[PDB]
Amino acid sequence: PLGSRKCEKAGCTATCPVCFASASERCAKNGYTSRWYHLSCGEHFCNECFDHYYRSHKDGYDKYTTWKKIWTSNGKTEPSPKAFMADQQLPYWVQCTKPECRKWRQLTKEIQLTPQIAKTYRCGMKPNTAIKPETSDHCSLPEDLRVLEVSNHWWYSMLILPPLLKDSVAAPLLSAYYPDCVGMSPSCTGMNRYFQPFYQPNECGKALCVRPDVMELDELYEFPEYSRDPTMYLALRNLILALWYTNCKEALTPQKCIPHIIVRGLVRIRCVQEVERILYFMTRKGLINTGVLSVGADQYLLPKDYHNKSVIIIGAGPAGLAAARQLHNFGIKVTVLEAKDRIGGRVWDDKSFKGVTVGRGAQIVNGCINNPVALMCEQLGISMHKFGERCDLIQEGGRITDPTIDKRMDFHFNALLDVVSEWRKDKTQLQDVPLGEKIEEIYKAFIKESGIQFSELEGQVLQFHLSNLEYACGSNLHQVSARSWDHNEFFAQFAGDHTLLTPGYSVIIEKLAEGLDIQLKSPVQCIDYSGDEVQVTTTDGTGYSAQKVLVTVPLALLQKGAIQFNPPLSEKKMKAINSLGAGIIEKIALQFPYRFWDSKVQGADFFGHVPPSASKRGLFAVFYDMDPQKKHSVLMSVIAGEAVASVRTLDDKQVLQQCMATLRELFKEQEVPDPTKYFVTRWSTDPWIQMAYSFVKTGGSGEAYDIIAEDIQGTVFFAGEATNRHFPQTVTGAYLSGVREASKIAAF
């Protein structure tokens, strides 16, 4: 009698449902029941089975309450018969491995899906015991009809509960969160120290961190349908990142992902269909499958849909090379045109010292946590050295400044910056004043208020901290803004250790450029995007063309206008480009026959140099020991601020002598040997660079970086350290800007 029931819920494509439970002896089967319980559009369970696990007098109450207790002590969502059925009773679905079949099948009730089963499953296979040949063809049997429904858009919305993954690789990295709030099952449960992808509760900001339970902005725009229900996405994304940082030397592919998506029910089918779209988003954005990883020939990191386009890259530095290796891996045509007769740009190592690599340019990694440079070091098996915190301030000549005098003046200097941060509050760009002009004004305005009188030693030790600040801005504080001198710290910066990349950045650079079509000695002089596609013309005349174009030239070269743009850049960009400063420092390295400083230095990775006057304050302020093993004996020092101008007419012999004049002051108690080898950078005069790293000019704003990074008509793109607002100046920034633009270029 009374045969058919139906479904209670709105929109269900099933009026005569079948039960999957098969629990109760009195299972209503396809027959009639008091009420159907909706799990999806292909999964309902009757009320007789509902009672089997729910009613204290039935034969399942013991399994349900055992699970219920565990669910309430590990999870945050409410335990329900519907949650139990979806986490324990639903049959797993597995897709056949046969390349020619690939049909989705339901496994028997008591079968527990494992990654090993999903890897080697074939139609009609019994995971019980091992492959003994059979005379029956299970791969021609019609695929269950509910499998096609699954990929209809509406299907997900009508899923009552979210998919909670079992045994996710991210489980260990998310033990601080309730499992079910990050897309994992409450009934569940040797990485590189520098890999910490997941925000931890109560943690402050640290760069390149994702929230395990919140979709970032670009994720909302890329997948809008997940702004109402984000659970499945967050589950798969945290798994992808968990897999990537678990093995960052291999290209992560949909194939090796699937065996780790473990969830009962048809929803799994939807998961493996989506993990592929999510995995390609992560790749285009550069969250995974990035770094020094090389792909070829053959196995391009994106579907051929992204492949049919050509782009030209101007400048083969960290930026242009980062984007090059990326667009190359995606499967896109890439031709990069460099000006100099070498690659690397502001990355230029000198491997001519004995048992030591010294960098004419970049060589320090500022904060290693989540830094792409640390990842690219894992991928290259390279190791780094962590700077000690000890830096003694040696005067002229020999005396190591008294700690009490040192701390004293560090406090006061930092205080001077506290009040600079106060004054600047609410001022506009028009009310901007040179940082240095403000610190002086505040400095005297304080000596006035109190008869406190600084000694010539205290006053000089303060100068060292002004030069130190000029060393980071690569400019005299009188040209650097007071409002925006640290604009970027408004955002989350790279935490962790500051290190010295011992092998040198050149390593990571040469590995990125490996196999790329890099035309050297091909300075670009004109760029015409007024036609159908872009036309890049070199200084000798050689013509190139491509659909897109990515300029990554140094800031200084954009202000000089070296490249003719047709049409020209917007008056706004020109203002944004010119409102930033082209910072500059120069380095100097000296090799000696023996370590003469070990006696007073005592291991310190460096030593400071207290300026005699405020004019010679940028002249070799800090001296770095370029051997973390303390074996060989090289020294590297820096010229910054006003001092880089007092040295632009001199030759190297002169610079050497001014550097030796100071070493022998700093070390008066001893004979300091003569440098058997040395070099004195000339980044100022290098025609295609003309700078060290950018800063914000008085009256400017960090918004300028974003304006520069604006693409034009979705054709011309920009990158470089002067286009990464969050992280300016650094190789890291220049690198991430490359990746960023690779993403933009691949979408269009």
Partner: peptide
């Protein structure tokens, strides 16, 4: 930018540290 400083980092002038109050918190 302060961020480029390695040896001897200046600490004054920083904006107040801030924290994301997640609800998936324990």
């Amino acid at each position: 930018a302060r961020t480029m400083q390695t040896a001897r980092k200046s600490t004054g002038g920083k904006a107040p540290r801030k924290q994301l109050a997640t609800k998936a918190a324990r």
